[PDB]
Amino acid sequence: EVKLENVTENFNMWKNNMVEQMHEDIISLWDQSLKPCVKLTPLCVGAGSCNTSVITQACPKVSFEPIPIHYCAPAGFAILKCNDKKFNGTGPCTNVSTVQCTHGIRPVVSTQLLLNGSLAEEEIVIRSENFTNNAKTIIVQLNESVVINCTGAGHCNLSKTQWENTLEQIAIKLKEQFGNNKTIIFNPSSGGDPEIVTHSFNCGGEFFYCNSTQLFTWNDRNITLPCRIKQIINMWQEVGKAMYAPPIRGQIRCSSNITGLLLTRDGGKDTNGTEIFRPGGGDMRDNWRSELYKYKVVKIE
């Protein structure tokens, strides 16, 4: 009389400890392969008074190629995988499966654009821990890559029509979410640290910073952006500044596949039947979630 049944499981991409583990890990990889020559961080005490802390250590420049990694289950636990089409990232998943390790990942620290990640199978998908709350970040997962090549000549090249179609489809998916009669507009960052304002990323150890204004100025040939390689930056691992050594080889290049975006929607509390979206990012944890949203580690019971 016993009935056979599939095991339904509940996922929450916004509360996945795999994210914190990866975050801790990428930090460990960097602390052992991309150490700063000088590091300045805030050193405080109870009362609330702080003095700057400075650390000087060896900072050897090294050639850096992408090493594919993945997370596997320790004896005793299993990794669940949601296979649902257009899975939201939270709620129960009907067609789930198990894997020993997650798919191979080529992690990239960046902002505004997600580089070299996994693409969506069907159409574009957008996910947020809460679309109504405008303080929460919107992760856009593309289903079609948009290549972007950069040169040491401070400029990255991006296909304009390719990229304009992308904003078109991204915009279309936002409507399905915020309303089919609402007006979708893309505006540049509202400001903050240079890491937040520009599209910044690390390619082979070098820290690039590109003006992204041309990418987020849109209403519903190539696109060359002004880029810069910096030696002095603000850290993504902790609050503080770091200084790295200059580049080794004269010409520094970089080829990356744009696979997603980090957006925010302006809290347009005012009645207007229009929504504004700007480049987001900053917490590298959202970069980790965009790849781990379909997994959930659990105990074998």
Binding site: P42, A135, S190, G191, G192, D193, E195, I196, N234, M235, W236, Q237, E238, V239, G240, G267, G280, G281, G282, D283, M284, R285
Partner: peptide
């Protein structure tokens, strides 16, 4: 992130400041 200095600077520009991981962002 240093929220204090973050709000301060953003505020001098008619915007509020909020942390974005370890970075400062102006809304």
């Amino acid at each position: 992130x240093n929220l204090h200095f973050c709000q301060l600077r953003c505020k001098s520009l008619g915007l509020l400041g909020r942390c974005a991981x370890t970075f400062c962002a102006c809304x």
